[PDB]
Design an enzyme around this catalytic site. Structure first.
Site, PDB file in Angstrom:
ATOM      1  CG  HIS A 223     -32.061  23.090 -94.152  1.00 48.31           C
ATOM      2  ND1 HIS A 223     -31.886  22.591 -95.424  1.00 48.31           N
ATOM      3  CD2 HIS A 223     -32.281  22.022 -93.360  1.00 48.31           C
ATOM      4  CE1 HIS A 223     -31.961  21.275 -95.400  1.00 48.31           C
ATOM      5  NE2 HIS A 223     -32.211  20.906 -94.158  1.00 48.31           N
TER       6      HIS A 223
ATOM      7  CG  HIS B 257     -27.506  18.709 -95.458  1.00 51.31           C
ATOM      8  ND1 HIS B 257     -28.396  17.840 -96.037  1.00 51.31           N
ATOM      9  CD2 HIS B 257     -28.179  19.294 -94.440  1.00 51.31           C
ATOM     10  CE1 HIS B 257     -29.563  17.914 -95.423  1.00 51.31           C
ATOM     11  NE2 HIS B 257     -29.462  18.796 -94.455  1.00 51.31           N
TER      12      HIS B 257
ATOM     13  CG  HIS C 171     -29.767  20.382 -87.155  1.00 47.56           C
ATOM     14  ND1 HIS C 171     -30.642  20.540 -88.199  1.00 47.56           N
ATOM     15  CD2 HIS C 171     -29.267  19.143 -87.272  1.00 47.56           C
ATOM     16  CE1 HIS C 171     -30.685  19.435 -88.901  1.00 47.56           C
ATOM     17  NE2 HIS C 171     -29.879  18.563 -88.348  1.00 47.56           N
TER      18      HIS C 171
END
Lengths: 570, 570
Positions: free
Chosen positions: A252, A355, A435
């Site tokens: 990520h 996450h 995000h």
């Protein structure tokens, strides 16, 4: 006897294609012991509407490459390149013809539509013809996930049974990394073998190439599996570090700080739970490392946040999470207490309870801002203390509840929102499964609000879903937050990215840069759309819209970056 | 089902021997998710007079290793090790027995005396029993030098002839790297396969492991062939960079600056001479590079100093130069004008005209001080200009002559020395074929004055030769140099090191540390002596003298370092 080197092409040395072997649409003009300065490179547009690429070249680069870097070539073409310099106080110029070879996709099978991902230029305003975007996407391998970490056998499991798995070793996929111009032409390619080898079983070359970010030197960091890297636009791999031995599964994000360290998102291997079972945790730790690979600090989110909070976890599209699929698309996720440890939606260390998928460093108070896809957005301090949280109020216990930011309108008056983040008589909304919660050049917090699990429910119908660019202004002293900008709410399903994606504010031309990585993901049999966007901050007018279509159906893209040649070769 | 990990040894995790696989006399106590601090490690002496090793361990190290590092083990022994820490405000202690395996020398042949180099303890004063020295030595491979760089065919060579060689690829040897205590016991070993593989032909793992120096983090840099490295005392390889593409042949020195850069000593490949011939230059370029491997700056000594000056070059023992004859030992070197380019004594770029072998960074004016074996000692500025020179005056033309330092006595009165550096009525002498011209913690310049070509001649007989430790004080403003300390003049041939070697001032106990790397090199059939020494700065009394004997005859040592466990694990 021998074979001589390439002779000189003009007034310097030979012009070498792809000197490092990782970037076939680059070249290098050998310096051949010439002493030069004030270097400028121009690569000419292909044809009538072809985009020309132009940049200066600093002394560090000339010395590092022992030559002049040539970035921007077209594939399989007789590129026309001009290089200008000063030498002995005299002005100098050379025109080179630089032939290139092809781009190769080494990972094709019966799911392949064709070898390369297709581009559709939708909209290019005037004064935006020169923009370049680095697209960080990926392509399925024939095999799929072939490897698992081995874990600890749990107490209540068959006497005869084999050990379970743990962690996220299957988060593994071939890269597809290029730069695209506003005619939709590929102007750079990073050879997939630079970092990845999906036919071999060398875990050193496995993973999911992610978190490509620029550095103060105009180079880039990245992560893939159990390593992290630094590379430059000539394809030189400048760093390659194994993760430190306690950690695994870096995905990520990777970002250089101004202190010469780098921030990474990992898991902790051999994490001892309170019940004494060892697992490899999922996406819930942060490392600050130096350029030696050593650990300067570690934030263990299992002791800082709340792994028990299932408020957003129970509200999600089972069909998503990248991962994906699909028989179960649309369906709301039903948590179970016996969910085996692994890359799975669930609570507790050893499941995917957080996450975290973005990192930003706040230099002003030596802290970090994190995007947790499944919990919200948080700032944590050097002291490992939560400073504030941007999320729906449901599920949060004290002491953490007390750090939630209170929403306010332009004059600072409270806004009434229920525990699910539904506000009344306002444009204000929180972010859900978001995000890239980063810090704009303005000092505000920009986020890509994907919008799955919006208002902590699945909607009545799948298509009632939308994604937003959104910007907030935060008062840390007062503990408040003000939505100051948004976009995309009104574009509906065709702009909805359930996963991945990014935005970043551009000050140069007052635009918001966006990439929506997963548009139409659930359209079975269709290519997935990655939509590059530059939105006028003032007028909300579209200045750039470009679509990248996946080379295989139902294949998400991760992120893109707006890159600038001017900065590439310092 | 599987196979379980090693279980916990006591109150933390398992104790893993050689976790990284490069340092078999080390171990690691797995942290197994325990939160600890105030860590202290003690390794007990073997037997009655055995030296105990003890150090604290900082947080960065615990986090980096995910465990407590154990340094100082004896080979093939039941090491007794104590680890103390604080955990939940309580004091804690574990006693471990750590069995080790053996040290292996993988490079043996009929020349071999035995597998390991022998140590002879000669003198250990009281209050010096705890000292440790890292010995950077080497051992011959069966094959010898098997590889050359290919160069350019010169104009006046046979039509039919093959291409020549260039550069110094044959500077290639197996390492032998250990730490010795004052009982003469090996207490650390660096696996030779860490960096070197002399049976394969992968040039990435060839060269001469050299220039081992400590860093602000308590780690070490080093060079070997065409790469440079950083490693730590647990044998973790932290950095590994290919040299930048314009350079080759890194030897002798690597030193981290305080700006996060590193200084390296290389040759330049594809160097265009004024006559238009391309060569790889020998030991006459300096790079500052960053932790990304990139070039920050470069000093091309062929345009800064004088490659034509043969005043010292013609006065040398043909038997030396490392490299070793030794049929022509003793004989004076007769320069020839047709000496083919290569690792060879001679003038001009492409021959070994400078042989620079040490580097130091002056943070006060952002400059560098260099030891050139064949020209003298020079300071060069960031601005690429010579600031001063410490050498005999013969051979130097203007503008360089003008930068020579003038010698002075304690009251600053000129000292009379002829052009060969012979002085009258003084202890003052210059340095000849010297090494490690470094800056002491006092601000003075220390040097190991090997003493070949002393006074720019060979003496009447070979044994009329000596080496000195020597320390100078310099007034840059006035252009003067004062010798303020010296040692070894009186000890004669038995303390003469014709090559390599090092000194460094230790402020902790007011000593001068020294290593004579090539004693009795010319004694045919005999082991070469590497003599470790600590001399009391005030009294000139020997505090430590320890001898390392080579495992093959006539095999030089390069350097040693005084290492301090307190600093190894920050």
């Amino acid at each position: 006897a021998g074979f001589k080197p390439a002779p000189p092409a003009g007034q310097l040395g030979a012009v070498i294609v792809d000197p490092y072997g990782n970037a076939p649409l680059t070249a290098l003009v050998d310096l051949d012991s010439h002493v030069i300065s004030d270097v400028k490179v121009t690569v000419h547009g292909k044809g009538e509407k072809g985009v020309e690429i132009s940049y200066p070249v600093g002394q560090e680069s000339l010395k590092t490459y022992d030559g002049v870097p040539i970035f921007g070539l077209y594939q399989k073409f007789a590129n026309k390149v001009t290089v200008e310099w000063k030498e002995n106080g005299k002005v100098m110029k050379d025109d080179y013809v630089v032939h290139t070879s092809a781009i190769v996709n080494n990972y094709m099978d019966n799911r392949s539509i064709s070898d390369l991902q297709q581009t559709k230029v939708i909209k290019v305003a005037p004064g935006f013809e020169d923009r370049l975007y680095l697209v960080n996407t990926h392509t399925f391998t024939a095999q799929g996930s072939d490897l698992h970490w081995h874990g600890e056998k749990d107490k209540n499991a068959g006497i005869l049974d084999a050990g379970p798995a743990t962690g996220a070793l299957p988060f593994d996929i071939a890269p597809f990394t290029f730069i695209v111009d506003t005619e939709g032409e590929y102007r750079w390619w990073l050879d997939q073998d630079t970092f990845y080898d999906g036919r071999d079983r060398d875990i050193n070359k496995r993973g999911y190439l992610m978190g490509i970010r620029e550095t103060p030197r105009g180079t880039f960091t990245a992560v893939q599996g159990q390593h992290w890297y630094e590379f430059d636009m000539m394809g030189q791999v400048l760093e390659d570090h194994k993760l430190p031995r306690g950690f695994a599964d870096a995905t990520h994000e990777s970002i250089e700080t101004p202190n010469g360290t780098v921030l990474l998102r990992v898991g902790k291997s051999n994490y001892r739970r309170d019940d004494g079972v060892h697992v490899t945790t999922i996406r819930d730790h942060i490392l600050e490392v130096d350029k030696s690979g050593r650990v300067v600090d570690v934030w263990d989110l299992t002791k800082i946040l709340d792994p028990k909070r299932d408020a957003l976890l129970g509200a999600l599209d089972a069909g998503a999470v990248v991962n994906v699929d699909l028989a179960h698309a649309g369906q709301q996720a039903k948590l179970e207490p016996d969910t085996p440890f692994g890359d799975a939606l669930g609570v507790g260390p050893g499941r995917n309870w957080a996450h975290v998928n973005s990192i930003a460093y706040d230099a002003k108070d030596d802290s970090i801002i994190l995007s947790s896809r499944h919990q919200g957005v948080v700032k944590i301090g050097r002291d490992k203390q939560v400073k504030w949280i941007l999320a729906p109020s449901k599920g949060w216990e004290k002491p953490l509840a007390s750090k939630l930011l209170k929403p306010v309108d332009a004059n600072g008056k409270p806004i009434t929102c229920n525990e699910n983040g539904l506000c009344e008589n306002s444009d204000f909304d929180f972010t859900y499964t978001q995000h890239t919660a980063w810090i704009s050049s303005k000092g505000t917090l920009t986020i890509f609000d994907n919008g799955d699990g919006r208002h902590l429910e699945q909607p009545a119908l799948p298509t009632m879903k939308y994604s937003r660019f959104v910007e907030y202004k935060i008062d840390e002293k007062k503990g408040t937050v003000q939505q100051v900008w948004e976009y995309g709410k009104e574009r509906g399903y065709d702009f909805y990215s359930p996963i991945t994606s990014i935005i970043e504010y551009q000050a140069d031309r007052n635009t918001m840069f966006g990439f929506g990585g997963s548009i139409h993901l659930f359209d079975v049999g269709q290519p997935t759309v990655g939509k590059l966007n530059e939105i006028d901050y003032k007028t909300k007018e579209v200045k750039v819209e470009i679509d990248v279509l996946s080379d295989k159906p139902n294949q998400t893209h991760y992120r893109a970056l707006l890159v600038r040649p001017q900065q590439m070769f310092k």
